[PDB]
Paper text:
Poxviruses are large DNA viruses which replicate exclusively in the cytosol, and encode poxvirus immune nucleases (poxins) to degrade 2′3′-cGAMP and prevent STING activation. While baculovirus and lepidopteran poxin homologs share <25% identity with VACV poxin, they are functional nucleases and retain 2′3′-cGAMP-specific cleavage activity. New poxin structures include the alphabaculovirus Autographa californica nucleopolyhedrovirus (AcNPV) poxin from Group 2, lepidopteran host poxins from the moth Trichoplusia ni and the monarch butterfly Danaus plexippus in Group 3, and the betabaculovirus Pieris rapae granulovirus (PrGV) poxin from Group 4.
The new poxin structures trap a post-reaction state following 2′3′-cGAMP cleavage and allow direct comparison with the catalytic mechanism of VACV poxin. Unlike the catalytic triad of histidine, tyrosine, and lysine residues essential for VACV and AcNPV poxin cleavage activity, the active sites of T. ni poxin and PrGV poxin are divergent. The T. ni and PrGV poxin enzymes share the conserved active-site histidine but lack a tyrosine residue entirely. Instead, both proteins contain a second histidine residue adjacent to the first, which forms a contact with the 2′ hydroxyl or 3′ phosphate of the cleaved 2′3′-cGAMP molecule. In the case of T. ni poxin, mutagenesis analysis demonstrates this second histidine residue is essential for activity, suggesting this residue functions as a general base to deprotonate and activate the 2′ hydroxyl nucleophile for in-line cleavage of the 3′–5′ bond. Further, the T. ni poxin protein shows substitution of the VACV lysine for an arginine residue, whereas the lysine is conserved in PrGV poxin. Unlike mutation of the lysine residue in the VACV and AcNPV active sites, mutation of the T. ni poxin active-site arginine to alanine only partially reduces activity, and a charge-preserving mutation of the arginine to lysine results in even less activity. A nearly identical pocket is conserved on the surface of the T. ni poxin protease-like domain, in which the poxin C-terminus is also coordinated by histidine and aspartic acid residues.
Author numbering:
A (entry chain B), B (entry chain A): 1 to 240
The structure:
């Protein structure tokens, strides 16, 4: 079955629309590809290392080619012969993160709402069938469309992400969090000057919550960058 | 003359509203203060060094007090006995930057539209007269309201900001810009790994333009962070 969706019966605006795709199963993971194009989180460390150098940089997407711009509506592949028509929502955003050993990418991505359960890697195309993005992560019924558009960036480091959930109202610093802001400064006094080298590269950190945060820290927990996220969902983001 | 505005005749919705302020003149520059609270860019390097430790961290604002939240309307001081009522616009945004020798702050700030020409430092208050912010920068008729609200962050470094204006469509990396993505890759290969120490702290870089960018770089221009700005104006931001 060349079906890129888990549920047996289709849901939503379905239309006849052939979009090629390839299916893979490794251990218990099942994912889809679009030629060379795969989600970064669906690759073995061997696959990640070989693709890091030959790829364009989209969050959690490996691809040897530039993706088409987004516009107002896209089609998501259901079968070899059918696809789902969905509006792109630039007001409901999801935060993506990824690492390929070279760049720790992040993106405040737009979404579309489907009640289907698409495989990671499912192709997303425009009216002309040009690949605009690939299914990566989902929060509820909202799937993240990783693209150039929207707020985004990347950290130059080999280190993977640290994904943390600080308690509500805590004063975040580095990979740590503290109950009071004064204690933050106390901990600030005890640390040395920030140190980065080839030996000890920086550490990317994502703090999920109501006050979401993107932080870059050195090996010792000293902060290099701190970024207050707004308008983006961070909690319960599932990588399919 | 206790006027916090340059133009001789008031414009806009003027209301009776007494707001304390002090006027200062250094060289040919004239700005206002609110007790301790002043704009960072209005300070001598000696004044900056003294306030860095005694301050709360708002972009281009020094203050010994926590700022009141941003409601929907604010009042801006014209003279000792009158002030202007202006609507706060969260959809037309301006990018702010500042440095105090400890934090290189940036902020996507909301704006208000006045035809008055306010001094830097003019107090901005809510209905209760609580200090909500201070006049810092403006683009055209749109003044930036520096607050906690909105997207923002800071870099830990002593270095000042580096402000560049790359040509349209160029591929930005670090402090340089290149014609295509390919040249960035070539330039990437010739560089060592980023090096940061107490001796060589990071460099904050702002790239203004259509695709505005926030970058953290080592002393030699190797990139540590890269951030694609969206939804904020960067080009004609004037620090009053
Ligand atoms: N600056 C800022 N921008 C925001 O958008 C924001 N949204 C919420 N809050 C919270 O309001 C309370 C007021 O402090 C804090 O609890 C704060 O949450 P937090 O963000 O968790 O706190 C970390 C402290 O820690 C501060 N530091 C970070 N680095 C340093 C440093 N090298 N030296 C001294 N202080 C440092 C950091 O600026 C800060 O303290 P200050 O605001 O007083 O400056 C914000 N604070
Ligand atoms: N990734 C990305 N996100 C965006 O939001 C975006 N908006 C516009 N563009 C431009 O589209 C063309 C696509 O290439 C580029 O001209 C690009 O302009 P730029 O974004 O201004 O140039 C930086 C190049 O340079 C890349 N690099 C950055 N650091 C490295 C590094 N260590 N090693 C290899 N490449 C690095 C950076 O990823 C990139 O190259 P990629 O094509 O691979 O994305 C974007 N690119």
């Amino acid at each position: 079955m060349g079906r890129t969706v888990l549920n047996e019966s289709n849901k939503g605006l379905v239309e006849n629309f052939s979009i090629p795709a390839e299916l893979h199963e490794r251990d218990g993971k099942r994912f889809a590809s679009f030629g060379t194009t795969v989600p970064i989180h669906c690759c073995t460390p061997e696959q990640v290392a070989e693709f890091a150098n030959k790829t364009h940089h989209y969050c959690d997407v490996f691809t040897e080619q530039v993706l088409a711009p987004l516009d107002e509506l896209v089609y998501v592949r259901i079968d070899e012969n059918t696809a789902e028509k969905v509006f792109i929502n630039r007001s409901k955003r999801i935060l993506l993160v990824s690492s390929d050993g070279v760049l720790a990418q992040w993106r405040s991505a737009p979404t579309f709402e489907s009640s289907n359960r698409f495989l990671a890697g499912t192709p997303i195309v425009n009216k002309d069938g040009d690949l605009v993005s690939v299914v990566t992560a989902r929060k509820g019924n909202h799937y993240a469309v990783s693209t150039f558009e929207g707020e985004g960036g990347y950290f130059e480091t080999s280190q993977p992400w640290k994904v943390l959930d600080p308690p509500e109202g805590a004063a975040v610093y580095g990979d740590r969090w503290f109950p009071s802001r004064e204690e933050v400064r106390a901990y600030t006094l005890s640390l040395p000057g920030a140190a980065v080298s080839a030996g000890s590269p920086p550490a990317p950190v994502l703090h999920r919550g109501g006050s979401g945060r993107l932080v870059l820290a050195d090996a010792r927990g000293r902060q290099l960058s701190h970024h207050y996220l707004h308008g983006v969902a961070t909690t319960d983001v599932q990588y399919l």
